[PDB]
Design an enzyme around this catalytic site. Structure first.
Site, PDB file in Angstrom:
ATOM      1  N   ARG A   1       0.104   4.578   2.982  1.00 60.66           N
ATOM      2  CA  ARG A   1       0.206   4.320   4.418  1.00 60.66           C
ATOM      3  C   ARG A   1       0.682   5.510   5.246  1.00 60.66           C
ATOM      4  NH1 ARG A   1       4.035  -0.535   4.780  1.00 60.66           N
ATOM      5  NH2 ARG A   1       4.401  -0.156   2.534  1.00 60.66           N
TER       6      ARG A   1
ATOM      7  N   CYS B   1       0.835  -1.195   0.000  1.00 58.12           N
ATOM      8  CA  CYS B   1       0.000   0.000   0.000  1.00 58.12           C
ATOM      9  C   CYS B   1       0.871   1.246   0.000  1.00 58.12           C
ATOM     10  CB  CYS B   1      -0.948   0.034   1.205  1.00 58.12           C
ATOM     11  SG  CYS B   1      -1.923   1.562   1.296  1.00 58.12           S
TER      12      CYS B   1
ATOM     13  N   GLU C   1      -5.517   4.040 -10.368  1.00 62.05           N
ATOM     14  CA  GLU C   1      -6.246   2.814 -10.045  1.00 62.05           C
ATOM     15  C   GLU C   1      -7.542   2.687 -10.832  1.00 62.05           C
ATOM     16  OE1 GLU C   1      -6.181   1.458  -5.703  1.00 62.05           O
ATOM     17  OE2 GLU C   1      -6.104   3.655  -5.546  1.00 62.05           O
TER      18      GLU C   1
ATOM     19  N   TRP D   1      -9.377   6.496  -0.264  1.00 64.01           N
ATOM     20  CA  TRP D   1      -9.679   7.259  -1.462  1.00 64.01           C
ATOM     21  C   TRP D   1      -8.714   6.798  -2.544  1.00 64.01           C
ATOM     22  CZ3 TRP D   1      -8.139   9.940   3.038  1.00 64.01           C
ATOM     23  CH2 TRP D   1      -6.779  10.271   3.080  1.00 64.01           C
TER      24      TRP D   1
HETATM   25  C1  HEM Z   1      -6.194   6.402   2.134  1.00 59.71           C
HETATM   26  C2  HEM Z   1      -5.920   6.284   0.828  1.00 59.71           C
HETATM   27  C3  HEM Z   1      -5.282   5.007   0.225  1.00 59.71           C
HETATM   28  C4  HEM Z   1      -4.668   4.976  -0.954  1.00 59.71           C
HETATM   29  C5  HEM Z   1      -4.452   6.177  -1.902  1.00 59.71           C
HETATM   30  C6  HEM Z   1      -4.206   3.629  -1.193  1.00 59.71           C
HETATM   31  C7  HEM Z   1      -3.521   3.204  -2.302  1.00 59.71           C
HETATM   32  C8  HEM Z   1      -3.256   1.887  -2.602  1.00 59.71           C
HETATM   33  C9  HEM Z   1      -2.822   1.398  -3.893  1.00 59.71           C
HETATM   34  C10 HEM Z   1      -2.637   2.347  -5.105  1.00 59.71           C
HETATM   35  C11 HEM Z   1      -2.653   0.067  -3.781  1.00 59.71           C
HETATM   36  C12 HEM Z   1      -2.233  -0.918  -4.896  1.00 59.71           C
HETATM   37  C13 HEM Z   1      -3.248  -0.756  -6.020  1.00 59.71           C
HETATM   38  C14 HEM Z   1      -3.220  -1.844  -7.053  1.00 59.71           C
HETATM   39  O1  HEM Z   1      -2.221  -2.603  -7.154  1.00 59.71           O
HETATM   40  O2  HEM Z   1      -4.230  -1.920  -7.786  1.00 59.71           O
HETATM   41  C15 HEM Z   1      -2.977  -0.327  -2.411  1.00 59.71           C
HETATM   42  C16 HEM Z   1      -2.933  -1.591  -1.840  1.00 59.71           C
HETATM   43  C17 HEM Z   1      -3.407  -1.961  -0.578  1.00 59.71           C
HETATM   44  N1  HEM Z   1      -4.004  -1.126   0.353  1.00 59.71           N
HETATM   45 FE1  HEM Z   1      -3.957   0.935   0.253  1.00 59.71          FE
HETATM   46  N2  HEM Z   1      -4.566   2.840  -0.119  1.00 59.71           N
HETATM   47  C18 HEM Z   1      -5.251   3.664   0.774  1.00 59.71           C
HETATM   48  C19 HEM Z   1      -5.816   3.268   1.966  1.00 59.71           C
HETATM   49  C20 HEM Z   1      -5.816   2.004   2.503  1.00 59.71           C
HETATM   50  C21 HEM Z   1      -6.495   1.581   3.711  1.00 59.71           C
HETATM   51  C22 HEM Z   1      -7.353   2.525   4.587  1.00 59.71           C
HETATM   52  C23 HEM Z   1      -6.259   0.274   3.882  1.00 59.71           C
HETATM   53  C24 HEM Z   1      -6.677  -0.695   5.005  1.00 59.71           C
HETATM   54  C25 HEM Z   1      -7.003  -0.274   6.241  1.00 59.71           C
HETATM   55  C26 HEM Z   1      -5.398  -0.165   2.799  1.00 59.71           C
HETATM   56  C27 HEM Z   1      -4.947  -1.450   2.622  1.00 59.71           C
HETATM   57  C28 HEM Z   1      -4.323  -1.901   1.467  1.00 59.71           C
HETATM   58  C29 HEM Z   1      -3.896  -3.261   1.225  1.00 59.71           C
HETATM   59  C30 HEM Z   1      -4.068  -4.450   2.208  1.00 59.71           C
HETATM   60  C31 HEM Z   1      -3.348  -3.292   0.004  1.00 59.71           C
HETATM   61  C32 HEM Z   1      -2.744  -4.539  -0.682  1.00 59.71           C
HETATM   62  C33 HEM Z   1      -3.814  -5.542  -1.079  1.00 59.71           C
HETATM   63  C34 HEM Z   1      -3.142  -6.787  -1.592  1.00 59.71           C
HETATM   64  O3  HEM Z   1      -2.068  -7.190  -1.059  1.00 59.71           O
HETATM   65  O4  HEM Z   1      -3.712  -7.374  -2.541  1.00 59.71           O
HETATM   66  N3  HEM Z   1      -5.185   0.909   1.971  1.00 59.71           N
HETATM   67  N4  HEM Z   1      -3.319   0.826  -1.736  1.00 59.71           N
HETATM   68  C1  LIG Z   2      -7.007  -7.766  -8.155  1.00 58.11           C
HETATM   69  C2  LIG Z   2      -5.520  -7.922  -7.918  1.00 58.11           C
HETATM   70  C3  LIG Z   2      -4.981  -6.769  -7.081  1.00 58.11           C
HETATM   71  O1  LIG Z   2      -5.426  -6.904  -5.725  1.00 58.11           O
HETATM   72  C4  LIG Z   2      -5.665  -5.775  -4.995  1.00 58.11           C
HETATM   73  C5  LIG Z   2      -5.231  -4.531  -5.452  1.00 58.11           C
HETATM   74  C6  LIG Z   2      -5.481  -3.378  -4.708  1.00 58.11           C
HETATM   75  C7  LIG Z   2      -6.137  -3.487  -3.484  1.00 58.11           C
HETATM   76  C8  LIG Z   2      -6.500  -2.291  -2.685  1.00 58.11           C
HETATM   77  C9  LIG Z   2      -6.980  -2.428  -1.383  1.00 58.11           C
HETATM   78  C10 LIG Z   2      -7.390  -1.308  -0.677  1.00 58.11           C
HETATM   79  C11 LIG Z   2      -7.351  -0.049  -1.261  1.00 58.11           C
HETATM   80  C12 LIG Z   2      -7.736   1.087  -0.549  1.00 58.11           C
HETATM   81  C13 LIG Z   2      -8.276   0.958   0.864  1.00 58.11           C
HETATM   82  C14 LIG Z   2      -7.677   2.334  -1.172  1.00 58.11           C
HETATM   83  C15 LIG Z   2      -7.198   2.416  -2.486  1.00 58.11           C
HETATM   84  N1  LIG Z   2      -7.119   3.600  -3.146  1.00 58.11           N
HETATM   85  N2  LIG Z   2      -6.833   1.293  -3.136  1.00 58.11           N
HETATM   86  C16 LIG Z   2      -6.877   0.084  -2.562  1.00 58.11           C
HETATM   87  C17 LIG Z   2      -6.468  -1.034  -3.285  1.00 58.11           C
HETATM   88  C18 LIG Z   2      -6.601  -4.727  -3.061  1.00 58.11           C
HETATM   89  C19 LIG Z   2      -6.351  -5.878  -3.799  1.00 58.11           C
HETATM   90  C20 LIG Z   2      -6.818  -7.232  -3.299  1.00 58.11           C
HETATM   91  N3  LIG Z   2      -8.005  -7.659  -4.052  1.00 58.11           N
END
Ligand code: HEM
Ligand SMILES: CCCOc1ccc(-c2ccc3c(C)cc(N)nc3c2)cc1CN
Ligand code: HEM
Ligand SMILES: CCCOc1ccc(-c2ccc3c(C)cc(N)nc3c2)cc1CN
Ligand SMILES: CCCOc1ccc(-c2ccc3c(C)cc(N)nc3c2)cc1CN
Ligand SMILES: CCCOc1ccc(-c2ccc3c(C)cc(N)nc3c2)cc1CN
Ligand SMILES: [Zn+2]
Lengths: 412, 409
Positions: B110, B107, B284, B279
């Site tokens: 963070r 992520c 994305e 957000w």
């Molecule tokens: C607040 C604004 C946030 C932004 C801009 C953001 C952005 C992103 C992006 C761009 C990715 C990867 C996207 C992709 O590969 O398609 C990601 C992954 C992830 N985000 Fe964030 N995120 C945010 C908030 C959060 C929050 C609040 C959580 C959980 C409490 C979170 C948990 C995760 C997790 C677990 C992943 C990885 C999922 C996986 O391993 O498949 N994110 N985030």
């Molecule tokens: C489909 C293969 C990629 O997996 C992915 C790819 C991205 C995320 C993910 C998770 C949370 C997000 C939040 C809270 C905000 C944000 N802006 N983006 C997020 C993107 C999850 C997964 C797991 N399904």
């Protein structure tokens, strides 16, 4: 776990890797840490060399379908006796050629490996002096350049002996542009090359002090102090950079050289170490680092392109950097193609690599690949390598990093 | 050993000590790196996991070894003895949920980890109650476009036969329909789940931007369908600041990314339903893969309307149209005052976040393969940033889709 599977998430194709069982050296990763984005995560003794040479000779005789033959056993005994009596051994010409091609084939970071079997290998193991190194390098440059129809090639100088008689090319590439740090802090020419430029001047080079001064060769033979040579300018093919639509782009005064020829890596074959082994192919368009040049006293090419495009440069969310970067890369490809100089765009190169990778899994049982380096530096997700899972591991023969020779050289 | 990470643009070197605390595997070995691979309890095993978490909780509030720390350990141990599980305190749930986000190596967002609104839904017993909790989550997180990070946590797994699950992959997504020829109406990513909803009784409007119903599973029962009230679904029409023809593509997207199919693990406990939202980063928004007509992508159609040469790849028409699409996404969210971040600002914030975390925590687990944005990678500051990836808990985990495990009734 004999098999490992990788998936392509766009096509759903699954490939099965068994080649990784032949991996030799550590990655730097463990079960609890991954060092995949880390840039890099005394000679061999007799007893260290016996098994490394046997592994290579075995691999060679397997590739020519003579494994276990009389010639294989006789070659093994010959190598063993050479190591016993001289602490090293000499490769046959065939083995040298096989070894160089496979170091390329095994280069996990190289997207261009579909071409690996067409490498032209120049054997320069009879070279004794820096003048002879210069001759070999000029012939390599002329052959590889081929008036713009580039051909991949490697020139291999004598292997390391005791570590005090190394052959080295001090240049990082055979053709690169000088960079000069000005008293006022700015940079004229290529900022990547300021340190090496200072070394050349220190060794006696008289710099033209322009934006695109081709650096001299700094060549070290048999552990002696390195010597400067000017590449003949007619051997250096260059491309002026212009844009199919933007009339003003040519007014930036940019050019680049056609031949990427990396010259500071070490080639390892069967425990032998070739510390001078320059190799060349052709460019992928995104590699050409004209972006870092300065147009004036303060602005990048990227910034200057955006300004001449009349982009809004006050907010990043206007994506002016992205827009300008695309146009610069359009100009690079257009110019090379217009001048009939071999170049490949990142869409074509990555599509070929996926075809290459699939063929290697089918015919060889795998293909080590470093995603962090294979995915191009722009437009990653719209190229087919982005959704392709890869396995990275280290096979030998291999190309390796080595220390800069000025840090280790004992000056005579 | 301490490990150094270097930024090759700034030459800043950070020293990582936090990786020494990681206990879960990454998938790599000494001989093979699997950094591009997508996916590489009993009573007896639960207390060590719980003790580890309770220890780091009381270390985080600077009361390690305190009376309350010891009593809590004694309480959790007795409770596992008598009931084969235990319940987190409200304070521990909030700490755990925030640190699962803090530990998400993939992520880039963070820097915001400690500003997470945690909704305790552990008293929920039915899919109707899940719907209510989820509606309140959506309304709070949307906040009329001033988006606020939130997570809602439903009851933890017990015997594995009574899981709470949100079957949707996100709370808000568009349906996708298999057309008679072969093209796709709506979102191609959601064709399979859409068919599941139709099989389950959902009547599809069969448009391009049909918000999918919620399909909600409580206590291992069969899942139930619910329509999110449309006034709770904030949407943004996509238009371009230069190209007046872009709005004629008819595209829009929803404002709230809320991922609902992952598993939250805290102190050995598994929360199989835990939708979390923030957000968007503009790159994305998957509006690229839509179909304008019977044969052309939005990317191909944008290139057409731009009058680019689409016969050779080396004209870079794909790269040009991609930038323009992403310009339009950002302009549209900003024009409607819906929170969004561009990939330049987001990666810049993440480098600052790494600096903060190395200074105060001794490291930051980071997955370069996922942190670097899917366009213009090398002109963002993360490209040249070395990262160390390692797995810390609490964490968010992948879990199988419920329709592969659920036995109906
Ligand atoms: C607040 C604004 C946030 C932004 C801009 C953001 C952005 C992103 C992006 C761009 C990715 C990867 C996207 C992709 O590969 O398609 C990601 C992954 C992830 N985000 Fe964030 N995120 C945010 C908030 C959060 C929050 C609040 C959580 C959980 C409490 C979170 C948990 C995760 C997790 C677990 C992943 C990885 C999922 C996986 O391993 O498949 N994110 N985030
Ligand atoms: C489909 C293969 C990629 O997996 C992915 C790819 C991205 C995320 C993910 C998770 C949370 C997000 C939040 C809270 C905000 C944000 N802006 N983006 C997020 C993107 C999850 C997964 C797991 N399904
Ligand atoms: C024929 C056309 C070739 C193309 C288009 C090509 C393309 C590339 C590219 C794009 C990279 C990464 C560049 C970067 O990240 O800056 C690379 C790396 C590399 N290439 Fe190739 N290459 C070609 C030929 C060759 C040849 C002939 C050899 C050796 C015989 C070779 C060996 C390598 C190695 C060892 C690396 C990794 C360097 C490192 O780890 O630092 N390549 N190549
Ligand atoms: C400074 C960190 C980056 O290192 C790098 C990055 C790239 C290459 C490299 C090597 C050979 C190439 C050939 C034959 C053709 C081509 N088109 N491109 C190449 C690129 C080498 C090194 C290390 N010398
Ligand atoms: C001593 C040479 C200094 O220059 C350097 C030094 C380092 C890098 C560099 C660093 C990290 C990279 C990652 C993580 C992926 C990738 N694909 N490439 C990278 C290239 C480039 C250059 C060239 N400016
Ligand atoms: C069942 C879900 C199908 O969708 C999927 C499935 C997979 C991926 C995917 C696969 C590989 C990735 C790599 C190596 C790096 C990265 N940074 N991202 C990736 C994302 C995206 C999507 C979204 N279309
Ligand atoms: Zn790894």
């Amino acid at each position: 776990p004999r098999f490992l599977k990788v998936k392509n998430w766009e096509t759903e194709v699954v490939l099965t890797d068994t080649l990784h069982l032949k991996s030799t050296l550590e990655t730097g990763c463990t079960e609890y840490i991954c060092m995949g984005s880390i840039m890099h995560p005394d000679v061999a003794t007799k007893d260290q060399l016996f098994p490394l040479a046997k592994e290579f000779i075995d691999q060679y005789y397997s590739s020519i379908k003579r494994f276990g033959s009389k010639a294989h056993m006789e070659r093994l005994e010959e190598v063993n006796k050479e190591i016993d009596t001289t602490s090293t051994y000499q490769l046959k010409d065939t083995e040298l050629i096989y070894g160089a091609k496979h170091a390329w084939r095994n280069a996990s970071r190289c997207v261009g490996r579909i071409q690996w079997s067409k490498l032209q290998v120049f054997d320069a193991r009879d070279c004794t002096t820096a003048h002879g190194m210069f001759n070999y390098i000029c012939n390599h440059v002329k052959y590889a350049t081929n008036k713009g129809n580039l051909r991949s090639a490697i020139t291999i100088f004598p292997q390391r002996t005791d570590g005090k008689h190394d052959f080295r090319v001090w240049n990082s590439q055979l053709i690169r542009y000088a960079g000069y740090k000005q008293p006022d802090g700015s940079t004229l020419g290529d900022p990547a090359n300021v340190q090496f430029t200072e070394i050349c001047i220190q060794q006696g080079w008289k710099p033209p002090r322009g934006r695109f001064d081709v650096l001299p060769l700094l060549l070290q033979a048999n552990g002696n102090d390195p010597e400067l040579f000017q590449i003949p300018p007619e051997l250096v093919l260059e491309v002026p950079i212009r844009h199919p639509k933007f009339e003003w782009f040519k007014d930036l005064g940019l050019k680049w050289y056609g031949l990427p020829a990396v010259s500071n890596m070490l080639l390892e074959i069967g425990g032998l170490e070739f510390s001078a082994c320059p190799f060349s192919g052709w460019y992928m368009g995104t590699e050409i680092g004209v972006r870092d040049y300065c147009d004036n006293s303060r602005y990048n090419i990227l910034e200057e392109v955006a300004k001449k495009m009349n982009l809004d440069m006050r907010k990043t969310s206007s994506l002016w950097k992205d827009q300008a970067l695309v146009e610069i890369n359009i100009a690079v490809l257009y110019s090379f193609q217009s001048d009939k100089v071999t170049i490949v765009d990142h869409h074509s190169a990555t599509e070929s690599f996926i075809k290459h990778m699939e063929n290697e899994y089918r015919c060889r049982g795998g293909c080590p690949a470093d995603w962090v380096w294979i995915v191009p530096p722009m437009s990653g997700s719209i190229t087919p390598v982005f959704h392709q899972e890869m396995l990275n591991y280290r096979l030998t023969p291999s190309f390796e990093y080595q220390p800069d020779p000025w840090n280790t050289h004992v000056w005579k």
